[PDB]
C-alpha cells in the first residue's frame, strides 16, 4: 500500500534504536565509541525518514490507524532505551563520555521533533491529538536524557 513507505521508515528507526538499546544494556564501562556510533545510526535513520516521507501524500484515516500500534511500540522502545542510558550515567561520565552523550541526544531531539512534525502533517486531523501524544512521549524522554547528562 502507501502506508508501506511509512512502515519501513518506522522499522528502520526501530532497528537502529534496538541496536542502541542492546549495546547500552551490555555496557558496563570502558570504551563507548560504539554507542556514539549507534546514536549516529539512529540520527541517520531519522534524517533518511525526513527525505522519504517528505514528498509523500497524506494518509487516509484507516491507513494512519494501521500505523498507530506500530508507532506506539517503537515509542515504548525509545522510552525504555533512554531510561537504560540514564541508568548507565555513572560509567559513561566516568569514561568522559558525558558531553558526547548530551550532544548526541540534543541532536537526536532536534531530528525527532522535525520528523514528528512532518509526520503529523501527513495524518488526518481527527488523529491530531494522538500524534501529539505520541510525539510528546519521545520529546519528553529525550529531554529527560538531556537533563540527566547535563553539567
C-alpha positions as a Markdown table, in Angstrom:
| # | Residue | x | y | z |
|---|---|---|---|---|
| 1 | Unk | 0.0 | 0.0 | 0.0 |
| 2 | Unk | 1.0 | 3.7 | 0.5 |
| 3 | Unk | 1.5 | 3.1 | 4.1 |
| 4 | Unk | 4.5 | 0.9 | 3.2 |
| 5 | Unk | 7.0 | 3.7 | 3.0 |
| 6 | Unk | 5.8 | 4.8 | 6.4 |
| 7 | Unk | 6.2 | 1.3 | 7.7 |
| 8 | Unk | 9.7 | 1.0 | 6.5 |
| 9 | Unk | 11.0 | 4.2 | 7.9 |
| 10 | Unk | 9.5 | 3.2 | 11.2 |
| 11 | Unk | 11.2 | -0.3 | 11.0 |
| 12 | Unk | 14.5 | 1.4 | 10.1 |
| 13 | Unk | 14.3 | 3.7 | 13.0 |
| 14 | Unk | 13.2 | 0.9 | 15.3 |
| 15 | Unk | 16.1 | -1.3 | 14.3 |
| 16 | Unk | 18.6 | 1.4 | 14.9 |
| 17 | Unk | 17.1 | 2.1 | 18.4 |
| 18 | Unk | 17.0 | -1.6 | 19.2 |
| 19 | Unk | 20.7 | -1.9 | 18.3 |
| 20 | Unk | 21.5 | 1.0 | 20.6 |
| 21 | Unk | 19.4 | -0.4 | 23.4 |
| 22 | Unk | 21.1 | -3.8 | 23.2 |
| 23 | Unk | 24.6 | -2.2 | 23.4 |
| 24 | Unk | 23.6 | 0.1 | 26.3 |
| 25 | Unk | 22.3 | -2.9 | 28.2 |
| 26 | Unk | 25.5 | -4.8 | 27.6 |
| 27 | Unk | 27.7 | -1.8 | 28.5 |
| 28 | Unk | 29.3 | -1.7 | 32.0 |
| 29 | Unk | 32.1 | 0.8 | 31.5 |
| 30 | Unk | 35.0 | 1.4 | 29.2 |
| 31 | Unk | 35.1 | 2.4 | 25.6 |
| 32 | Unk | 31.7 | 3.8 | 24.4 |
| 33 | Unk | 32.5 | 4.9 | 20.9 |
| 34 | Unk | 30.2 | 2.1 | 19.5 |
| 35 | Unk | 27.4 | 3.7 | 21.5 |
| 36 | Unk | 28.0 | 7.1 | 19.9 |
| 37 | Unk | 28.1 | 5.4 | 16.5 |
| 38 | Unk | 24.8 | 3.7 | 17.4 |
| 39 | Unk | 23.4 | 7.1 | 18.2 |
| 40 | Unk | 24.6 | 8.4 | 14.8 |
| 41 | Unk | 22.9 | 5.4 | 13.1 |
| 42 | Unk | 19.6 | 6.5 | 14.7 |
| 43 | Unk | 20.1 | 10.1 | 13.6 |
| 44 | Unk | 20.8 | 9.0 | 10.1 |
| 45 | Unk | 17.7 | 6.8 | 10.0 |
| 46 | Unk | 15.6 | 9.7 | 11.3 |
| 47 | Unk | 17.1 | 12.1 | 8.6 |
| 48 | Unk | 16.5 | 9.4 | 5.9 |
| 49 | Unk | 12.9 | 9.3 | 7.1 |
| 50 | Unk | 12.6 | 13.0 | 6.5 |
| 51 | Unk | 13.6 | 12.6 | 2.9 |
| 52 | Unk | 11.5 | 9.5 | 2.2 |
| 53 | Unk | 8.3 | 10.8 | 3.8 |
| 54 | Unk | 8.6 | 14.4 | 2.8 |
| 55 | Unk | 7.1 | 14.1 | -0.7 |
| 56 | Unk | 4.5 | 11.5 | 0.4 |
| 57 | Unk | 0.8 | 12.3 | 0.1 |
| 58 | Unk | -1.2 | 12.4 | 3.4 |
| 59 | Unk | -2.5 | 9.2 | 4.8 |
| 60 | Unk | -6.1 | 8.2 | 4.9 |
| 61 | Unk | -7.7 | 7.8 | 8.3 |
| 62 | Unk | -7.7 | 3.9 | 8.0 |
| 63 | Unk | -4.1 | 4.0 | 6.7 |
| 64 | Unk | -2.8 | 6.1 | 9.6 |
| 65 | Unk | -4.8 | 4.0 | 12.2 |
| 66 | Unk | -3.0 | 0.9 | 10.9 |
| 67 | Unk | 0.3 | 2.6 | 12.0 |
| 68 | Unk | -0.7 | 3.8 | 15.5 |
| 69 | Unk | 0.1 | 0.4 | 17.1 |
| 70 | Unk | 3.5 | 0.1 | 15.5 |
| 71 | Unk | 4.4 | 3.7 | 16.4 |
| 72 | Unk | 3.4 | 3.2 | 20.0 |
| 73 | Unk | 5.6 | 0.1 | 20.0 |
| 74 | Unk | 8.7 | 2.0 | 18.9 |
| 75 | Unk | 7.8 | 4.8 | 21.3 |
| 76 | Unk | 7.8 | 2.3 | 24.2 |
| 77 | Unk | 11.2 | 1.1 | 23.0 |
| 78 | Unk | 12.6 | 4.7 | 22.7 |
| 79 | Unk | 11.4 | 5.4 | 26.3 |
| 80 | Unk | 13.0 | 2.2 | 27.7 |
| 81 | Unk | 16.2 | 2.9 | 25.8 |
| 82 | Unk | 16.6 | 6.4 | 27.2 |
| 83 | Unk | 15.9 | 5.0 | 30.7 |
| 84 | Unk | 18.6 | 2.4 | 30.2 |
| 85 | Unk | 21.0 | 5.1 | 29.0 |
| 86 | Unk | 20.3 | 7.2 | 32.1 |
| 87 | Unk | 20.9 | 4.1 | 34.2 |
| 88 | Unk | 24.4 | 3.9 | 32.7 |
| 89 | Unk | 25.2 | 7.5 | 33.5 |
| 90 | Unk | 27.9 | 6.7 | 36.1 |
| 91 | Unk | 30.1 | 4.6 | 33.8 |
| 92 | Unk | 29.6 | 6.9 | 30.9 |
| 93 | Unk | 30.5 | 10.1 | 32.7 |
| 94 | Unk | 33.3 | 8.2 | 34.4 |
| 95 | Unk | 34.7 | 7.4 | 31.0 |
| 96 | Unk | 34.4 | 11.0 | 30.0 |
| 97 | Unk | 31.5 | 10.5 | 27.6 |
| 98 | Unk | 29.0 | 12.7 | 29.3 |
| 99 | Unk | 29.4 | 15.7 | 26.9 |
| 100 | Unk | 29.2 | 13.5 | 23.8 |
| 101 | Unk | 26.1 | 11.7 | 25.0 |
| 102 | Unk | 24.5 | 15.1 | 25.9 |
| 103 | Unk | 25.3 | 16.3 | 22.4 |
| 104 | Unk | 24.1 | 13.2 | 20.6 |
| 105 | Unk | 20.8 | 13.4 | 22.5 |
| 106 | Unk | 20.4 | 17.1 | 21.6 |
| 107 | Unk | 20.9 | 16.3 | 18.0 |
| 108 | Unk | 18.5 | 13.4 | 18.2 |
| 109 | Unk | 15.9 | 15.6 | 19.9 |
| 110 | Unk | 16.1 | 18.0 | 17.0 |
| 111 | Unk | 15.9 | 15.4 | 14.3 |
| 112 | Unk | 13.0 | 13.7 | 16.2 |
| 113 | Unk | 10.9 | 16.8 | 16.6 |
| 114 | Unk | 11.3 | 17.7 | 13.0 |
| 115 | Unk | 10.4 | 14.2 | 11.9 |
| 116 | Unk | 7.3 | 14.1 | 14.1 |
| 117 | Unk | 6.2 | 17.4 | 12.7 |
| 118 | Unk | 6.5 | 16.2 | 9.2 |
| 119 | Unk | 4.7 | 13.0 | 10.1 |
| 120 | Unk | 1.8 | 14.9 | 11.9 |
| 121 | Unk | 1.3 | 16.8 | 8.7 |
| 122 | Unk | 0.5 | 13.6 | 6.9 |
| 123 | Unk | -2.1 | 12.3 | 9.3 |
| 124 | Unk | -5.8 | 13.3 | 9.2 |
| 125 | Unk | -6.9 | 15.9 | 11.7 |
| 126 | Unk | -9.2 | 13.6 | 13.8 |
| 127 | Unk | -6.0 | 11.8 | 14.8 |
| 128 | Unk | -4.1 | 15.0 | 15.6 |
| 129 | Unk | -4.4 | 14.5 | 19.4 |
| 130 | Unk | -2.9 | 11.0 | 19.1 |
| 131 | Unk | 0.0 | 12.2 | 17.0 |
| 132 | Unk | 0.6 | 14.9 | 19.6 |
| 133 | Unk | 0.6 | 12.4 | 22.5 |
| 134 | Unk | 2.9 | 10.1 | 20.6 |
| 135 | Unk | 5.3 | 12.9 | 19.6 |
| 136 | Unk | 5.4 | 14.3 | 23.2 |
| 137 | Unk | 6.4 | 10.9 | 24.5 |
| 138 | Unk | 9.5 | 10.9 | 22.5 |
| 139 | Unk | 10.3 | 14.6 | 23.1 |
| 140 | Unk | 9.9 | 14.2 | 26.9 |
| 141 | Unk | 12.1 | 11.1 | 27.1 |
| 142 | Unk | 14.9 | 12.7 | 25.2 |
| 143 | Unk | 14.7 | 15.9 | 27.2 |
| 144 | Unk | 14.8 | 13.7 | 30.3 |
| 145 | Unk | 18.0 | 12.2 | 29.0 |
| 146 | Unk | 19.5 | 15.6 | 28.2 |
| 147 | Unk | 18.9 | 16.9 | 31.7 |
| 148 | Unk | 20.4 | 13.7 | 33.2 |
| 149 | Unk | 23.6 | 14.2 | 31.2 |
| 150 | Unk | 23.9 | 17.8 | 32.0 |
| 151 | Unk | 26.6 | 19.6 | 33.9 |
